[PDB]
Structure 1
Amino acid sequence: LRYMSRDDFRVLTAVEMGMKNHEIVPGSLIASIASLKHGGCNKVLRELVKHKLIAWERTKTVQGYRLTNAGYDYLALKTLSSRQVVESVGNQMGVGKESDIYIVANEEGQQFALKLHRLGRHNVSWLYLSRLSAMKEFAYMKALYERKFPVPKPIDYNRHAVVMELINGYPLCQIHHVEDPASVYDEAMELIVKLANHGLIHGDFNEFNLILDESDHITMIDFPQMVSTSHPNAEWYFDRDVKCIKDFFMKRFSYESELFPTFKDIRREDTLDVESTIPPELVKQKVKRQLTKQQKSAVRRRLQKGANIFTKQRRENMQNIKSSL
């Protein structure tokens, strides 16, 4: 849980700055880009290693710290807390392979769903691929909700976290019986034609990516696999998804289809496949920026002398040599 709520923001963000450019970030660089408090950040790092926030690395010459899987997760929730979306944690968690579903509650008490991308090449690249995944998923989530589609409502995105509307139900793969099989079938078949009208093919439109809300309403999730209709095999991915649903309702619910939708309509809807002159106030700001940069460069060279590990190794052998002589 989150108790510490001051210096932990600045130190962890400073790691993320170094993570985008380099692998393991040395402790010398951290304090320079987090200049608000000086000296006492080294004990904060020792509190960060207690939790699964940062990992230590002392291989051969490389001495420093790298951000963990769970440590990257805490940073997004800390940003979402300032945007007043997340306050307390709900416990109903569906631990998946590509993502983790966490229930979140706001100031109001209204429960929302949170998605956290867990892509698992070094861990630096793995925590960068999760960044691009959430930004792509939120892009489709906004694009479909605006265009009448039955998708969860997009709220906020932070690095890898995506806040969505809480639609609670069961996935189609674990459904025994539906009270009205025909009405549910026609609803699902319409949504494939709907996407094709907007110039989109789902690709993997199966029973594993569909959730029923009280056996009345079909909800769609997971959107990183979507392709354009400009693709040469556009009708192939269209027909494969149709046959997947055609066979499933005949298999599980024993419903044979009377309507066979195979229409190519591109595009009647929006193409979503793309988706003295200088005042003294300014003089003061400019002088300040110059004077801070001169101090920051000097502090970097003071911190680069921390090598402490090199001095410790040299001292051990000297004691052995003098005793043997």
Structure 2
Amino acid sequence: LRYMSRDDFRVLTAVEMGMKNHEIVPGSLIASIASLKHGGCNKVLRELVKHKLIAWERTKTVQGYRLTNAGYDYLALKTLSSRQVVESVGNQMGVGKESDIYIVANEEGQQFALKLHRLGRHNVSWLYLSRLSAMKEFAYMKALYERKFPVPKPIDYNRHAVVMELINGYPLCQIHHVEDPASVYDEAMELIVKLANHGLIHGDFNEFNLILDESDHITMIDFPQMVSTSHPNAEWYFDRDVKCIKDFFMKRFSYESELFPTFKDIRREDTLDVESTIPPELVKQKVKRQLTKQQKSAVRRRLQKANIFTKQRRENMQNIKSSL
């Protein structure tokens, strides 16, 4: 965990800004764009590599450092802590290969869920696609909670991380016996009708994605793949989902269906398928920005001054002298 909270923020955000333009970031750029402390940043990077925060990269000529997955996770968690959202960690690990579930607790002690997108060419594309997936998933959760669907309340997001409302329960697959199958089944077709009314069709609406909150409430998650009803294949996905729910109910709980909704109703709800006149203070600020720009250029071109080549040349000269 974190102990010192002074300059890992600035160095790691400098690494993040380095990753946005190119693969492997030299230390000169980090020292130029993180200018609060100078000289001691080498030992800061030496302290970061003892964890899995950053990683060195020196193959034949390129010499730099890159951000790892755990460093990005701690960066998002630090940004959440700056928002006063996470204080302690609950270790109920939902270990998935597409997402990691970590319980969090705020200063008030109220527990929330934390979704960390792990997607699995090097890992910069993995982190960027994780960021895009987290952004679109947060947008989808916001839309579904605005449309009053039975989903948790979204709380916050930071660049891959989603702090999300916590509801305890088990998925519908590993609940062997249900006392009232008919009521929750009718509610399931009610939710299917609601989703189809909202200009949306799931495509892979599975029972494993349905979490039984105390076997009384339905919790629904995992919408990166959410598609439109304007597609000609939309009703085929809708009928596939309906038949999947039907065969699951006549196959697992031994309960036979009574209502058979086959309605395509688009779009009677919201179309979510798209979803000295200048004062001297300004003069001072502009001149300060200019002089910081020239001194940042100077710091860049001074920090950009390969000792491995000089060491190899010295070794070659010494070997030529001692061998001839």
Same fold (TM over 0.5): yes
CA distance in 1 between counterparts of 2:317 and 2:69 reads: 41
Identity over aligned residues, as a percent? 100
**Per-residue deviation, 1:262:** 0.7
Deviates more, 1:99-108 or 1:268-277: 268-277
Aligned-pair distance for 1:8? Answer: 0.2
Number of equivalenced pairs: 324
Offset, 1:18: 1.0
Question: How many angstroms apart in 1 are the aligned matches of 2:315 and 2:213?
Answer: 68
Q: How far, CA to CA, are the matches of 1:4 and 1:309 in structure 2? A: 33
Q: Secondary structure of 1:242's partner?
A: helix
How far residue 197 of structure 1 moved from its aligned partner, in angstroms, is: 0.5
State how far apart, in whole Å, the 2-side matches of 1:57 and 1:47 are. Answer: 16
Task: State the shift of 1:308 in Å.
Answer: 2.3
What CA distance in whole angstroms lies between the structure 2 residues aligned with 1:222 and 1:315? 59
Match runs of 1:157-236 below 5 Å: 157-236=157-236
Deviations 1:86-142 (A, max 9, x none): 111111011101000000000000000000000122111111000000000000101
Shift of 1:314: 2.0
The alpha carbon displacement at 1:315 in A equals: 2.2
Q: Cα deviations across residues 131-188 of structure 1 (Å, max 9, x unaligned)?
A: 0000000001011111110111100110000011111111112110101011111111
Distance apart, 1:318 and its partner CA: 2.1
Cα deviation, 1:213-265, whole Å, max 9, x if unaligned, reads 00111110000011010001111000000000101111110011010011111
In structure 2, the residue matched to 1:47 is 47
Distance 1:31 1:192 in 2: 55
SS of 2:154's equivalent in the other structure is coil
Deviation at 1:2, TM superposition (A): 1.2
Measure the CA separation in 1 of the matches of 2:196 and 2:9: 45
After superposition, give the CA deviation of every residue in 1:175-209 in whole Å (9 maximum; x if it has no partner).
10101011111111111111111100111101121
TM-score, length of structure 2 as denominator length: 0.98
The RMSD of aligned alpha carbons is 0.9
Q: Distance in 2 between matches of 1:314 and 1:181?
A: 79
Gap regions ≥5 residues in structure 1:
none
Distance 1:123 1:258 in 2: 50
Q: For residues 288-309 of structure 1, give each alpha carbon's deviation from its aligned partner in whole angstroms, at most 9, with x where no partner exists.
A: 011111111111111111x223
Shift of 1:61: 1.3
Supply the distance in 2 between the matched residues of 1:190 and 1:169 (Cα, whole angstroms).
21
Shift of residue 31, structure 1, vs aligned partner:
0.6
Deviation string 1:44-82 (CA, Å, 9 cap, x unpaired) is 001110111001000111110111111111100000001
Q: TM-score scaled by structure 1?
A: 0.98
Secondary structure of the residue aligned to 1:155 is strand
Q: Distance in 2 between matches of 1:160 and 1:313?
A: 43
1:316 and 1:205 mapped to 2: Cα distance? Answer: 66
Q: State the alpha-carbon separation in 2 of the partners of residues 304 and 208 from structure 1.
A: 54
Q: Distance in 2 between matches of 1:315 and 1:260?
A: 83
Q: C-alpha displacement at 1:312, in angstroms?
A: 2.4
**What is the alpha-carbon distance in structure 2 between the residues aligned to residue 228 and residue 251 of structure 1?**
29
Alpha-carbon offset, residue 268 of structure 1: 1.2
- How far 1:319 moved relative to its partner? 2.0
Counterpart-to-counterpart distance in 1, 2:316 and 2:278: 62
Q: CA deviation at 1:4?
A: 1.7
1:277: Cα distance to partner? Answer: 1.2
